Amino acid sequence: NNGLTPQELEAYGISDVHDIVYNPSYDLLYQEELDPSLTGYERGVLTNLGAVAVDTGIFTGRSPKDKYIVRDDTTRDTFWWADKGKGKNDNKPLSPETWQHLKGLVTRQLSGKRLFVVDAFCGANPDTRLSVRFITEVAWQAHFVKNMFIRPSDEELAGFKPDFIVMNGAKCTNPQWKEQGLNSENFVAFNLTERMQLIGGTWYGGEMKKGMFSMMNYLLPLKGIASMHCSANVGEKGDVAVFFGLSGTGKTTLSTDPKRRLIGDDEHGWDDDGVFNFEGGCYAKTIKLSKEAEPEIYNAIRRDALLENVTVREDGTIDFDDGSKTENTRVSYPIYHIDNIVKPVSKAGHATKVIFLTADAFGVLPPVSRLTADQTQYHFLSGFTAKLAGTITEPTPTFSACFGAAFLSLHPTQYAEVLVKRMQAAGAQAYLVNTGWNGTGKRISIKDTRAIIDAILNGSLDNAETFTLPMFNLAIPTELPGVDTKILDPRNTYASPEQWQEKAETLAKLFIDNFDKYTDTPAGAALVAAGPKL
Numbered sequence: 044n045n046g047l048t049p050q051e052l053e054a055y056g057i058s059d060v061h062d063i064v065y066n067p068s069y070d071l072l073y074q075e076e077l078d079p080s081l082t083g084y085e086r087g088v089l090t091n092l093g094a095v096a097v098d099t100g101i102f103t104g105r106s107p108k109d110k111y112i113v114r115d116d117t118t119r120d121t122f123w124w125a126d127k128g129k130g131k132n133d134n135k136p137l138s139p140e141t142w143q144h145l146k147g148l149v150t151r152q153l154s155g156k157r158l159f160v161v162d163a164f165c166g167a168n169p170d171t172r173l174s175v176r177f178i179t180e181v182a183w184q185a186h187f188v189k190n191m192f193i194r195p196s197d198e199e200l201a202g203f204k205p206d207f208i209v210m211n212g213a214k215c216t217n218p219q220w221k222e223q224g225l226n227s228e229n230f231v232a233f234n235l236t237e238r239m240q241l242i243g244g245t246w247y248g249g250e251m252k253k254g255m256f257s258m259m260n261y262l263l264p265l266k267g268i269a270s271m272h273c274s275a276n277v278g279e280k281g282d283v284a285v286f287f288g289l290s291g292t293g294k295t296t297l298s299t300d301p302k303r304r305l306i307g308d309d310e311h312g313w314d315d316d317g318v319f320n321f322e323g324g325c326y327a328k329t330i331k332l333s334k335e336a337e338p339e340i341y342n343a344i345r346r347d348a349l350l351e352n353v354t355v356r357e358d359g360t361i362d363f364d365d366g367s368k369t370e371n372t373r374v375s376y377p378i379y380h381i382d383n384i385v386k387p388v389s390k391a392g393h394a395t396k397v398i399f400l401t402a403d404a405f406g407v408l409p410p411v412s413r414l415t416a417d418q419t420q421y422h423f424l425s426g427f428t429a430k431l432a433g434t435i436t437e438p439t440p441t442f443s444a445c446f447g448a449a450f451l452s453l454h455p456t457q458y459a460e461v462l463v464k465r466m467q468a469a470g471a472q473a474y475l476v477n478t479g480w481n482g483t484g485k486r487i488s489i490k491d492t493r494a495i496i497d498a499i500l501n502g503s504l505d506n507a508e509t510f511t512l513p514m515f516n517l518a519i520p521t522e523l524p525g526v527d528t529k530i531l532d533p534r535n536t537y538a539s540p541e542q543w544q545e546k547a548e549t550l551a552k553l554f555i556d557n558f559d560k561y562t563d564t565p566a567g568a569a570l571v572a573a574g575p576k577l
């Protein structure tokens with residue numbers, strides 16, 4: 044029935060829907076979250092910055108072990124399954140039967156309640172975008188999807204017909220999990236035949252964000268459109284730059300550059316016209332957030348922005364440095380909270396600069412180096428980054444294909460293939476930047492990192508004289524405008540170049556061991572030459 048009547052939700056299996064809050068405004072959401080009635084995790088608090096902060100509960104990040112995709116006649120022969128001959132991933136198969144069981148738990152949990160329904164888009168271009176309908180019973184959750192996805196116009200809602208439905212049943216869990224062979228009572232399931240996503244047990248909003256991203260990572264490459272885990276911005280001359288990288292590497296902090304127009308900060312596609320954003324907002328990290336170091340992001344934290352897991356003092360002030368509940372404190376905000384952005388549609392032309400961000404805890408890789416075409420692919424499939432696990436003692440490596448393995452629905456080489464095709468057609472140049480550590484035991488400052496990005500974007504790096512770094516065979520500059528020459532050669536940051544050597548051999552070996560699983564095909568076996576060598 045036209046409009047968005049309760050009888051329309053009955054088709055989804057939801058019953059006794061009393062009140063339906065359809066596409067709530069930011070003001071409605073504001074009063075909903077501050078309602079003194081609210082108890083538990085539904086309760087939001089007001090901070091001295093005018094933004095409301097919520098607690099996501101026990102889950103303060105994604106839960107890949109609870110992710111499942113229904114294996115049926117639609118997904119069977121196309122999906123990159125975790126139990127298939129292909130690589131290690133989180134795409135665990137699920138039977139249609141267990142799906143229906145999980146669906147029953149969700150629809151029942153959402154029956155006889157006041158439901159928030161947010162209609163939106165995933166993808167800036169109408170020809171490849173997904174019309175998604177989110178259903179929840181928690182206000183701050185509908186707020187999160189309002190911030191993160193593309194907010195439709197009144198005229199667009201008129202002819203709005205969803206392609207995908209996501210039902211968030213955070214308050215319910217699956218008690219029959221042991222009998223079904225699942226990881227736990229919690230669940231994040233997808234069914235491509237019904238085009239739905241179910242969430243149970245976990246309150247974390249990121250599951251809906253990354254969940255839709257995973258779906259885009261499935262549909263687009265099959266159409267020849269690159270789907271990427273990267274930030275992106277444009278210059279006044281129209282030069283587009285994409286920044287790939289794993290979590291915590293700098294895609295958001297570095298693309299948020301006042302001198303350039305922000306396209307997006309995390310999920311983009313690349314078609315015949317160019318690079319386009321999937322989202323309608325940004326999701327910044329807030330631990331130890333410095334207003335001096337990252338002023339644009341700090342000023343975005345105001346009414347309508349949603350703080351997550353941050354610790355708010357009695358006086359309402361936020362302690363950004365406190366990571367007691369989690370180091371993964373975040374804040375989402377609609378994109379317009381950033382001044383210099385592409386308006387009204389988040390898209391631009393083909394990218395000409397392709398930057399790979401990595402936080403090397405081993406202190407081996409150089410701050411910046413220009414990559415050859417074969418090294419571009421080698422490093423893309425490698426997806427290296429290292430944290431520093433050890434209360435930061437003993438660096439621990441992470442190799443995540445395409446810089447976002449956790450969101451891949453297809454085999455990694457399928458993404459590399461479509462990426463290489465787009466880069467070629469545009470004569471794009473690739474670079475590798477170490478936003479991490481060096482022999483000093485301290486992470487490179489944001490100031491130094493921004494200077495390096497400018498040199499890459501302004502061309503002064505392309506004109507610089509370079510020499511080859513041994514083992515990894517990376518072309519590194521002799522000098523660069525704005526940055527200290529001493530840090531350009533990673534070996535200079537150690538007391539003796541012998542220290543670098545030893546650590547470099549360790550890292551090189553890890554890379555070689557990791558890439559070995561790709562050498563099954565001639566193309567990948569050919570790429571081994573583009574990797575490190577002892």
Ligand SMILES: Nc1ncnc2c1ncn2[C@@H]1O[C@H](COP(=O)(O)OP(=O)(O)OP(=O)(O)O)[C@@H](O)[C@H]1O
Nearest residue numbers: 289290291292293294295296328478487488489492
């Ligand atoms: N030199 C540096 N370069 C970049 N970021 C730095 C640097 N030094 C410190 N940081 C901090 O590291 C983090 C980089 O975070 P960022 O939010 O950009 O990750 P991201 O790539 O967007 O990951 P995700 O996909 O999870 O959003 C921020 O907390 C930033 O303040």
Ligand SMILES: [Mg+2]
Nearest residue numbers: 294295309326
């Ligand atoms: Mg980010």
Ligand SMILES: [Mn+2]
Nearest residue numbers: 272289290309
């Ligand atoms: Mn991300």
